[PDB]
Write a protein that binds this ligand. Structure first.
Ligand SMILES: CCOC(=O)[C@H]1CN(S(=O)(=O)c2ccc3cc(Cl)ccc3c2)CCN1CC1CCN(c2ccncc2)CC1
Ligand SMILES: [Ca+2]
Lengths: 51, 235
């Protein structure tokens, strides 16, 4: 648990569901398999710099 | 934008400028979605009828990613009061969806809890705009970004000369001459977390530009999520 150690190891959002931690992303991304990363779904995801 | 650097290519793609009938850019904004733009409520006054330009980095040399849009519906927060600048926030519904391409993209809205606990607890955030660059100077022609550190709430309240409601927040420098300025309102204040940016505030006000002892007040977006949310459904 602990969304306090290092954001729970999540890529973006973080939630301490009861005993453990649960990650999530903003509209546009999708939670990877590891349930910690965030994966886009469009060429232009929010928050990303268009480089 | 006093001091600060210069927004390079696709380095501030969420930046949006509100233009007047004279085509002049008078305020800022933040692209939340292809249809919705986040801005300051008090900006809906320095113009009778305005439009919103996006994907523009230089207001002189014609690039290519620019694009103008028309407000279909303005959504001013009822509770706003020019008398206090409280609830300085509005959301603009565009008629034509915005087309994301280089120098054009939406910024992420965070969760209220997570955000306040991880994004405003950070050391700094980003503010950008076409605004004045020396309090007395003229409106800038190039879009620029300024890394501004967060200000201790208490220090904030003490340094001010006005009531800092729960709806606003402090960010900037005490002595350093760096801080937003004229025509920079509505602008975006974003906070970076792992290379992805989140909307952590609207450009609201301040007592001058870069004035020593004084800071720059930002509309605490975090405290307006649910509104902005059921706002992007029009309300
Ligand atoms: C002498 C010139 O000053 C004034 O008259 C101008 C200057 N401009 S700016 O373009 O230079 C401006 C706009 C947005 C900013 C945003 C940030 Cl974050 C920092 C600095 C900013 C500076 C704003 C309005 N005041 C004038 C005042 C009017 C009275 N004010 C309040 C605040 C809260 N409750 C009740 C009243 C604060 C602001
Ligand atoms: Ca241009």
């Amino acid at each position: 648990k602990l969304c306090s150690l290092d954001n729970g190891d999540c890529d973006q959002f973080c939630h301490e569901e009861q005993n453990s931690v649960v990650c999530s992303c903003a509209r546009g991304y999708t939670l990877a398999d590891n349930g910690k990363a965030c994966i886009p779904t469009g060429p232009y995801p929010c928050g990303k710099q268009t480089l | 934008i006093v001091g600060g650097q210069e927004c390079k290519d696709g380095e501030c793609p969420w930046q949006a400028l509100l233009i007047n009938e004279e085509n002049e850019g008078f305020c800022g904004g933040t692209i939340l979605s292809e249809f919705y733009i986040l801005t300051a409520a008090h900006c809906l006054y320095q113009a009778k009828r305005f439009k919103v330009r996006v994907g523009d980095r230089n207001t002189e040399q014609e690039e290519g990613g620019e694009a103008v849009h028309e407000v279909e519906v303005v959504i001013k927060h009822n509770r706003f009061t020019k008398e206090t600048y409280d609830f300085d926030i509005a959301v603009l519904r565009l008629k034509t969806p915005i087309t994301f391409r280089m120098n054009v993209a939406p910024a992420c809205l965070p969760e209220r809890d997570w955000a306040e606990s991880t994004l405003m607890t950070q050391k700094t955030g980003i503010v950008s705009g076409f605004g004045r660059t020396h309090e007395k100077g003229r409106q800038s022609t190039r879009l620029k970004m300024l890394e501004v550190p967060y200000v201790d709430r208490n220090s904030c309240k003490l340094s001010s000369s006005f009531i800092i409601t729960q709806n606003m927040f402090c960010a900037g420098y005490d002595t350093k001459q760096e801080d937003a300025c004229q025509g920079d309102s509505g602008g975006p204040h974003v906070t970076r977390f792992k290379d992805t940016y989140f909307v952590t505030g609207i450009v609201s006000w301040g007592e001058g530009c870069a004035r020593k002892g004084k800071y720059g007040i930002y509309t605490k977006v975090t405290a307006f999520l649910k509104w902005i949310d059921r706002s992007m459904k029009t309300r």
